[PDB]
Each structure stands twice: as structure tokens, then as C-alpha cells.
Amino acid sequence: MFEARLVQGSLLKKVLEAIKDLLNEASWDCADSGIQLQAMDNSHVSLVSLNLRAKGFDKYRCDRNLIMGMNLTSMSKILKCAANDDIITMKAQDNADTVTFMFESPNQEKVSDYEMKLMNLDQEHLGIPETDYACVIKLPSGEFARICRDLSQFGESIVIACTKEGVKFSAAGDIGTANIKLAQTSSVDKEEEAVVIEMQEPVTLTFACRYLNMFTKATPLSPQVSLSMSPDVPLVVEYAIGEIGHIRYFLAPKI
Structure with missing residues (x-):
């Protein structure tokens, strides 16, 4: 499966905010070094590119490969339900039709669990035509x-x-x-x-x-x-x- 578990849940949420209003639907690519997000905004002018590396999660694990088609607003409701010591953990099966985030607490014992629905997309990875800028x-x-x-x-x-x-x-x-x-x-x-x-x-x-x-x-x-x-x-x-x-x-x- 896929189980990426960040010590500091806050981080993910912050990231949602950084996108949320730009992109209304994104595919998170998962592989052995981590998640990667490529999208062209609602009005097709700006481009978001996000990388998150294995070494940074407290526990990373993508056996196979995943294009998770999460809608970002919904996902934003969910993160918005986290707290700022909350241990997020996305989780998914191989061809999982659903991703689960599951929040634990460090100095409490409530355990949240939200499953959201995954969407299908085409993914248009226009590269980042690498230059050395002036x-x-x-x-x-x-x-x-x-x-x-x-x-x-x-x-x-x-x-x-x-x-x-x-x-x-x-x-x-x-x-x-x-x-x-x-x-x-x-x-x-x-x-x-x-x-x-x-x-x-x-x-x-x-x-x-x-x-x-x-x-x-x-x-x-x-x-x-x-x-x-x-x-x-x-x-x-x-x-x-x-x-x-x-x-x-x-x-x-x-x-």
C-alpha cells in the first residue's frame, strides 16, 4: 500500500492553503522518494509544482506507484479538521478508489479518520524547461x-x-x-x-x-x-x- 506519515501534520495543511484557491483538482504522484504534484491553474496561467521527499516523512512507503486523484477543496475540509500537533497519515491500497487520512494526537487520545474519494484525471506534465536564470x-x-x-x-x-x-x-x-x-x-x-x-x-x-x-x-x-x-x-x-x-x-x- 501507501502510508506516508508526517510528524508535523500542520505542514500538509499549510500546503493545501498554498494551492487550494489556485487548483480545484490535483493528482498526487506517489513513488519511492515521495509525492509530487503538477498542475496548471483554473485559468491556465500559473503552474504549481510540488515535491515532498521520503526522507522528510516520519514514515514513507510507496511499494507500487500511485496517481491519487484527490479533489483539493474536499481535501482542504479534511486537513482543516486537523490540529497543529496532529499526525496525518494518508493511506491507500494499490488501485485504491479512496485515500484515508488518519489523525492521532501526541498528548491526547482522539483518533480521527477521514476517507475521501479519488478522481480520475489526465496528467499533463509539461516540464520545467530548466534554465539558469539571469x-x-x-x-x-x-x-x-x-x-x-x-x-x-x-x-x-x-x-x-x-x-x-x-x-x-x-x-x-x-x-x-x-x-x-x-x-x-x-x-x-x-x-x-x-x-x-x-x-x-x-x-x-x-x-x-x-x-x-x-x-x-x-x-x-x-x-x-x-x-x-x-x-x-x-x-x-x-x-x-x-x-x-x-x-x-x-x-x-x-x-
Whole structure:
């Protein structure tokens, strides 16, 4: 069968939040190193890619191989029934028509068990045409978040411009023009505090806003986030899921 058992249930839930509003139905691929999730959002613009590795679960086990076709909203109700010390455990038979999550408690003895129904899908693994991007920004995830939320009240679009020393976010509305600017981190300190740019040649791109705002759902997962940018190639917002893997959001520029 399949029995992936994470010590810190919270994690999975967080991940649900990071997707939930983007994708309304996903197939979790299970194999010997772990689960992997590939989907193109409701409106087919952004792309989610999720990895979760065997070594990170307290107990991993995929004998055979599973495309689990879980609907995400339903799954979100279920996780939402967990607590934050709750031991999740997805479980499934080989061609299981159902996946079971089963929550235990560390300092209690209630034992939840929710079985949800699995769906069939086609799975369109468009690759991540791997490039070495022109500019890698690392920055505080909650900073990036505060930024994205703020600048949405002006434009529908965000201009992200990096140079060797700083990154700049900019928005123009029928209301006002707005410019937020981060300089780079003197003395490479705590990542909650650290802006660090590896800068080959300057990049300046426009992105849509609702999408940044949804990618920033993933903010709790890591206190850091990392925008990799090159011209004409999509943009990668990458949150580390903290030692178990990570989630990448892919978005195309405009203009």
C-alpha cells in the first residue's frame, strides 16, 4: 500500500492553503522518494509544482506507484479538521478508489479518520524547461507577501526590476504610482531578514497581480522565498517546504 506519515501534520495543511484557491483538482504522484504534484491553474496561467521527499516523512512507503486523484477543496475540509500537533497519515491500497487520512494526537487520545474519494484525471506534465536564470533574488517570504498585497491596490500588474545592489517593485493605477525598494543584505544574516541577489545582467519584468497574491499563500511554509528571473522565460516563486521538499509557482510575464 501507501502510508506516508508526517510528524508535523500542520505542514500538509499549510500546503493545501498554498494551492487550494489556485487548483480545484490535483493528482498526487506517489513513488519511492515521495509525492509530487503538477498542475496548471483554473485559468491556465500559473503552474504549481510540488515535491515532498521520503526522507522528510516520519514514515514513507510507496511499494507500487500511485496517481491519487484527490479533489483539493474536499481535501482542504479534511486537513482543516486537523490540529497543529496532529499526525496525518494518508493511506491507500494499490488501485485504491479512496485515500484515508488518519489523525492521532501526541498528548491526547482522539483518533480521527477521514476517507475521501479519488478522481480520475489526465496528467499533463509539461516540464520545467530548466534554465539558469539571469537573476536570483532570495528574500523574506512575509516581506514579499506584505509587498504583493500592498501594491495590488494600485495596478493590475507589477514591475520587478533587479540590479546588482537592489530589487524594486512598482505599480501604477488610476489612483497613484507606488514604488517599494529592497536593498541587499549586509552581513548574510537570518533568512527572515535576508535579501540576497545573484545578478548576472539586470532584469526588468511585468507580472500579473492576482497570481503573485495567490503564490504568497505559501508564505507560512518558509520564512524565505526566491524569485528567479530571466527575460522571456517564466518566473519562479519558490517556497521551501522546510526539509521535506518545496513548492514552485511558475508565472509568465506580459507586455
